[PDB]
């Protein structure tokens, strides 16, 4: 399951990034 890391890391990218632009406005 190497290959579902992979992404679990893409998606963390969202969430934070968002929590960046929430707390930005």
């Given at each position: 399951?190497?290959?579902?890391?992979?992404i679990?890391?893409?998606?963390?990218?969202?969430?934070?990034?968002f929590?960046?632009?929430?707390?930005?406005?």
């Amino acid at each position: 399951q190497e290959e579902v890391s992979v992404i679990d890391a893409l998606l963390a990218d969202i969430r934070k990034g968002f929590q960046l632009r929430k707390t930005a406005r």
